[PDB]
Design a protein around this motif. Structure first.
Motif, PDB file in Angstrom:
ATOM      1  N   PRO A  42      10.695   2.989 -10.792  1.00  0.00           N
ATOM      2  CA  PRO A  42      11.716   3.342  -9.800  1.00  0.00           C
ATOM      3  C   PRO A  42      11.156   3.975  -8.525  1.00  0.00           C
ATOM      4  N   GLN A  43      10.197   4.882  -8.681  1.00  0.00           N
ATOM      5  CA  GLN A  43       9.589   5.562  -7.543  1.00  0.00           C
ATOM      6  C   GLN A  43       8.877   4.580  -6.607  1.00  0.00           C
ATOM      7  N   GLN A  44       8.023   3.730  -7.171  1.00  0.00           N
ATOM      8  CA  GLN A  44       7.294   2.746  -6.380  1.00  0.00           C
ATOM      9  C   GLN A  44       8.226   1.752  -5.707  1.00  0.00           C
ATOM     10  N   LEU A  45       9.266   1.341  -6.425  1.00  0.00           N
ATOM     11  CA  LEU A  45      10.233   0.400  -5.878  1.00  0.00           C
ATOM     12  C   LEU A  45      10.880   1.036  -4.656  1.00  0.00           C
ATOM     13  N   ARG A  46      11.215   2.315  -4.775  1.00  0.00           N
ATOM     14  CA  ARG A  46      11.838   3.036  -3.675  1.00  0.00           C
ATOM     15  C   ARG A  46      10.940   3.057  -2.445  1.00  0.00           C
ATOM     16  N   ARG A  47       9.679   3.426  -2.641  1.00  0.00           N
ATOM     17  CA  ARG A  47       8.727   3.504  -1.542  1.00  0.00           C
ATOM     18  C   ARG A  47       8.506   2.141  -0.900  1.00  0.00           C
ATOM     19  N   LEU A  48       8.507   1.100  -1.723  1.00  0.00           N
ATOM     20  CA  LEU A  48       8.322  -0.258  -1.218  1.00  0.00           C
ATOM     21  C   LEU A  48       9.406  -0.545  -0.178  1.00  0.00           C
ATOM     22  N   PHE A  49      10.660  -0.390  -0.584  1.00  0.00           N
ATOM     23  CA  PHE A  49      11.772  -0.651   0.322  1.00  0.00           C
ATOM     24  C   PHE A  49      11.867   0.324   1.492  1.00  0.00           C
ATOM     25  N   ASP A  50      11.462   1.573   1.277  1.00  0.00           N
ATOM     26  CA  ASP A  50      11.477   2.546   2.369  1.00  0.00           C
ATOM     27  C   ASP A  50      10.511   2.064   3.442  1.00  0.00           C
ATOM     28  N   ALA A  51       9.338   1.613   3.006  1.00  0.00           N
ATOM     29  CA  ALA A  51       8.316   1.120   3.921  1.00  0.00           C
ATOM     30  C   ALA A  51       8.850  -0.051   4.743  1.00  0.00           C
ATOM     31  N   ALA A  52       9.477  -1.009   4.067  1.00  0.00           N
ATOM     32  CA  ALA A  52      10.026  -2.181   4.744  1.00  0.00           C
ATOM     33  C   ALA A  52      11.119  -1.787   5.726  1.00  0.00           C
ATOM     34  N   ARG A  53      12.068  -0.985   5.255  1.00  0.00           N
ATOM     35  CA  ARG A  53      13.185  -0.533   6.078  1.00  0.00           C
ATOM     36  C   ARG A  53      12.780   0.181   7.367  1.00  0.00           C
ATOM     37  N   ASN A  54      11.717   0.981   7.298  1.00  0.00           N
ATOM     38  CA  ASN A  54      11.234   1.749   8.448  1.00  0.00           C
ATOM     39  C   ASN A  54      10.358   1.007   9.441  1.00  0.00           C
ATOM     40  N   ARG A 105       0.838  -1.193   0.000  1.00  0.00           N
ATOM     41  CA  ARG A 105       0.000   0.000   0.000  1.00  0.00           C
ATOM     42  C   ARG A 105       0.877   1.248   0.000  1.00  0.00           C
ATOM     43  N   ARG A 106       1.946   1.223   0.789  1.00  0.00           N
ATOM     44  CA  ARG A 106       2.856   2.357   0.847  1.00  0.00           C
ATOM     45  C   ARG A 106       3.566   2.560  -0.482  1.00  0.00           C
ATOM     46  N   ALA A 107       3.820   1.464  -1.188  1.00  0.00           N
ATOM     47  CA  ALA A 107       4.497   1.518  -2.478  1.00  0.00           C
ATOM     48  C   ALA A 107       3.588   2.124  -3.535  1.00  0.00           C
ATOM     49  N   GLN A 108       2.311   1.767  -3.472  1.00  0.00           N
ATOM     50  CA  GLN A 108       1.332   2.251  -4.433  1.00  0.00           C
ATOM     51  C   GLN A 108       0.819   3.648  -4.103  1.00  0.00           C
ATOM     52  N   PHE A 109       0.782   3.985  -2.818  1.00  0.00           N
ATOM     53  CA  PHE A 109       0.292   5.294  -2.392  1.00  0.00           C
ATOM     54  C   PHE A 109       1.357   6.102  -1.654  1.00  0.00           C
TER      55      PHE A 109
END
Lengths: 26, 67
Positions: B38-50, A21-25
């Motif tokens: 690239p943007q979504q991939l970044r957010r994906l890993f940022d979410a996991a890391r945090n 969800r965080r990746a998509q939003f």
């Protein structure tokens, strides 16, 4: 092992939903 | 609540396994989902890391694992 705990905890599916969800939003 | 359940699970894994399991959770989302760019991939890993901090796991900060 860590990989084992991952699998034995449903591959942290709840964490996957949150991460997806965080990746998509945002 | 996804986050809530996520934190409950993360608190049951050995502290030294926290980042390694989060890395695996991130890879699972990358593999199983359509990650647009690239943007979504970044957010994906940022979410996991945090997550260690978001879940308030004692002495563990953001996981510095690579994407």
């Amino acid at each position: 092992r860590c990989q084992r705990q991952f699998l034995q905890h449903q591959r942290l599916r709840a964490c996957q939903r949150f991460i997806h969800r965080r990746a998509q939003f945002g | 609540p996804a986050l809530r359940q996520c934190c409950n699970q993360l608190r049951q894994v050995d502290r030294p396994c926290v980042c390694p399991v989060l890395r695996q959770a991130a890879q699972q989302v990358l593999q199983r989902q359509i990650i647009q760019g690239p943007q979504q991939l970044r957010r994906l890993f940022d979410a996991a890391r945090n997550l260690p901090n978001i879940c308030n796991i004692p002495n563990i900060g953001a996981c510095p694992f690579r994407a």
